[PDB]
Amino acid sequence: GIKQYSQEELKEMALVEIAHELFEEHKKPVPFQELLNEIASLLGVKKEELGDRIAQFYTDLNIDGRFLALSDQTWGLRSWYPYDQLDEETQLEHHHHHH
């Protein structure tokens, strides 16, 4: 799954951490609902069953240290500009422990 994560490793991570890797795999910008539909599919669930996790994901992602929204609906991964990885999987979910 995605780079090297099997389903159990994905299901244990925050939806935003999945979203980083999904985007690091994608390297393209995705609308919220469509990205969510891919997340839904990664987890093997219906997006409606996520209930609380929807609002959580939205709140988490929208104030996240990763992601940048392009026009409005779409979100894009930040790695396509300088910071600590320029489109390279050199980081693999950048928790960035200190430096």
Which residue segments constitute the domains of the chain, with CATH numbers given?
6-81 (1.10.10.1250)
Quote the strand ranges of 1-99, DSSP E.
30-31, 68-69, 74-76
The last residues before gaps in the chain (C-N over 2.5 Å) are: none
- The answer to whether 10 and 42 have CB atoms below 8 angstroms apart is yes
- The answer to whether 9 and 81 have CB atoms below 8 angstroms apart is no
> 49's torsion region: left (phi>0), alpha (psi -120 to 50) or beta?
alpha
